[PDB]
Design a protein around this ligand. Structure first.
Ligand SMILES: [Ca+2]
Ligand SMILES: [Ca+2]
Ligand SMILES: [Ca+2]
Ligand SMILES: [Ca+2]
Ligand SMILES: [Ca+2]
Ligand SMILES: [Ca+2]
Ligand SMILES: [Ca+2]
Ligand SMILES: [Ca+2]
Ligand SMILES: [Ca+2]
Ligand SMILES: [Ca+2]
Ligand SMILES: [K+]
Lengths: 109, 115, 112
RNA sequence: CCUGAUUGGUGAGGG
RNA sequence: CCUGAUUGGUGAGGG
RNA sequence: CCUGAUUGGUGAGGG
């Protein structure tokens, strides 16, 4: 589905303030398989898309929230990296309240 | 690490380190711990989770299981060494004589549940 | 006291104790060590009262072939063993210097 | 050779 | 061999 | 009860 730029900015902001996160397809997938992932953010410009094509299905199966952001380069920066990130998983939010809200807004779509 | 057979909550890890600190007689280090388990005098074996190469302590869980000796884990070898009264790390510790029988029995039971 | 030990040699006995890597302090631990055959040298204080507490040691060591000697005071022996109190007897399990022990055991074995 | 505790019961010293 | 960062958690290094 | 370290690995504490 498509997420509004307003929300994406909030998603990127959410990753930036998070206390603990996982960066990278391998670690994100593990975080979801272990169920320690609270929210999963996925980049829309991942090529080949096959790298993250399995995430949406896995999250729903594990009952974990997930949304998309336009830039993997932007997602990586929000994760504290100097390089891109195809996906990120928030393990410990920065502001519990905001997260619960952000998650609800996403679940709407 | 593959040698860590089960997850021990941080609160219980604290209890394990406390047990080591209050113990009347312990063995510290892989060689003395292994000798104690083989001699059958260990009552509880505590293994650090961050030992590398893992091969140094990987035999302990299996050995204890064979001897019917209780074992558990703590996250840091540095913390375990400190609890054992050292200024350095310890990959493992064996409690030979606990400080209080009842406390040990309760702790061992809590571990057997996590097991 | 089966034999007399020169003050100079008693000093060496006390120093051997202080330098040892592993010792047993006290009648029960000394006796257990001799019985288990891990004691290399037993030192007995001469002013133990009742003397019955350590009376068995000379015979036990002889029966085990373990070297033993005496020192004037239990207070000094205890201090040498690292205690703040007296010790009726001490057993050296692991000395600090092999050569020295062998030399001391010799000096004592000739005094007997 | 230089570095200098970044090492360490993952086994020192002694027997 | 040349180019020289155009590559990149899309998994380096380590165990 | 008083004395108050005169006691003490000549075996405390723990298992
Ligand atoms: Ca250090
Ligand atoms: Ca240091
Ligand atoms: Ca050695
Ligand atoms: Ca670039
Ligand atoms: Ca670049
Ligand atoms: Ca590729
Ligand atoms: Ca006194
Ligand atoms: Ca006193
Ligand atoms: Ca008495
Ligand atoms: Ca007792
Ligand atoms: K590393």
């Amino acid at each position: 589905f498509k997420v509004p730029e307003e929300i994406q900015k909030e998603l990127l902001d959410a990753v930036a303030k998070a206390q603990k996160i996982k960066k990278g397809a391998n670690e994100v997938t593990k975080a979801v398989e272990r169920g320690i992932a609270k929210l999963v953010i996925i980049a829309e410009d991942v090529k080949p898309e096959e790298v993250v094509a399995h995430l949406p299905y896995l999250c729903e199966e594990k009952g974990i929230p997930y949304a998309y952001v336009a830039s993997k380069q932007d997602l990586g920066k929000a994760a504290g990296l100097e390089v891109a990130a195809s996906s990120v998983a928030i393990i410990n939010e920065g502001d519990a309240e905001e997260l619960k809200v952000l998650i609800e807004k996403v679940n709407v779509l």
